[PDB]
Amino acid sequence: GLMQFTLPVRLCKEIELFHFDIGPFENMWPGIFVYMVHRSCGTSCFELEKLCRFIMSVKKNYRRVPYHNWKHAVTVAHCMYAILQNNHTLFTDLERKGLLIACLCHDLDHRGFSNSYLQKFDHPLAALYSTSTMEQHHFSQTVSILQLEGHNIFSTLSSSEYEQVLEIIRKAIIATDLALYFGNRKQLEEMYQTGSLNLNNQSHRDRVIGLMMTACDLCSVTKLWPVTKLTANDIYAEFWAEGDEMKKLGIQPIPMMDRDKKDEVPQGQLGFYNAVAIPCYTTLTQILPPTEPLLKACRDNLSQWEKVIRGEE
Ligand SMILES: Cn1ncc(C(=O)N2CCC2)c1C(=O)Nc1cccc(-c2nc3ccccc3o2)c1
Ligand SMILES: [Mg+2]
Ligand SMILES: [Zn+2]
């Protein structure tokens, strides 16, 4: 009850910044996450014994893949923490509880393959969930872990509060389907420009939490250049393995996934920064002004990729 988590000085300060890197010491990631829940939500919102057991079960259900691993889960949760901390008064007690858990759980049991590859492979998950395949599975894995003995971190919520938090978590995890991001951002852009955006409209909140989820999920593009550049290696390690599996099924992969077209990576990052990242953090900064450091860091990284192309690195 009086058991406060404390970080070493440099972490205590740097963890409040959007561009914080959680570091290569795995055994500290759980304490980093509790620290973020305690400061974001209160030291009262979860039973520590249940939270710790929830976190360790969630960790055990991430796989040893190069990118969509336990470190991605905690990085994405840290990005959400930064947003919530910079937008204190805009979010309810339940949204703060739900969204950090959503971020930790958002890629549970990811095998390092896209929804596309599952569909072309004819994976059982593709038959069970026709759209947002992996994301309905991640949500499904989250409920499973929540139903383990001694793992219900929401035990002291009412029936209605419990259904609300699981609904926040479900929508939050589905929104990490980047196929859904494009229309969600276009609608938020229109609603912001015409002035119809209303944070008391529940369907409007849903959309704003969706864009935050996309923003946190993509947050490798908002780190310092060395973190961004080295995360891109892990991202492409998975992409190229998927490309290999596409060729094994008799299908030429898109160039993004073809390790033969490794040369085209820098131009591919430009496309992604221009088509996805910059629009995402632009719309997010318009709706939530204090998230502007994500946009600025993203722009800096775009400029760094332009320098790679111009043979300056
Ligand atoms: C940095 N980052 N962070 C998350 C993701 C992402 O999309 N994820 C889905 C699971 C994480 C990415 C990312 O880089 N996406 C991306 C998007 C569109 C195109 C390209 C691209 N690269 C190419 C290289 C050579 C030729 C053509 C190429 O096209 C790359
Ligand atoms: Mg995902
Ligand atoms: Zn993710």
Curated annotation (Swiss-Prot):
Active site: 68
Residue positions binding 3',5'-cyclic GMP: 68, 269
Superkingdom, taxonomy of origin: Eukaryota
Location(s), subcellular: Cytoplasm, Cytosol
Domain PDEase: 1-312
Binding residues for a divalent metal cation 2: 107
Protein residues bound to 3',5'-cyclic AMP: 68, 269
Binding site for a divalent metal cation 1: 72, 106-107, 217
Annotated tissue distribution: Abundant in the putamen and caudate nucleus regions of brain and testis, moderately expressed in the thyroid gland, pituitary gland, thalamus and cerebellum.
Domain notes: The tandem GAF domains bind cAMP, and regulate enzyme activity. The binding of cAMP stimulates enzyme activity.
Disease: Dyskinesia, limb and orofacial, infantile-onset: An autosomal recessive, early-onset hyperkinetic movement disorder characterized by axial hypotonia, dyskinesia of the limbs and trunk, orofacial dyskinesia, drooling, and dysarthria. The severity of the hyperkinesis is variable. Striatal degeneration, autosomal dominant 2: An autosomal dominant disorder characterized by striatal degeneration and dysfunction of basal ganglia, resulting in hyperkinesis.
Assembly and interaction partners: Homodimer.
Function: Plays a role in signal transduction by regulating the intracellular concentration of cyclic nucleotides. Can hydrolyze both cAMP and cGMP, but has higher affinity for cAMP and is more efficient with cAMP as substrate. May play a critical role in regulating cAMP and cGMP levels in the striatum, a region of the brain that contributes to the control of movement and cognition.
Similarity field: Belongs to the cyclic nucleotide phosphodiesterase family.
Protein name: cAMP and cAMP-inhibited cGMP 3',5'-cyclic phosphodiesterase 10A
Organism: Homo sapiens
Gene: PDE10A
Whole sequence portion shown: 724 to 1036 of 1055
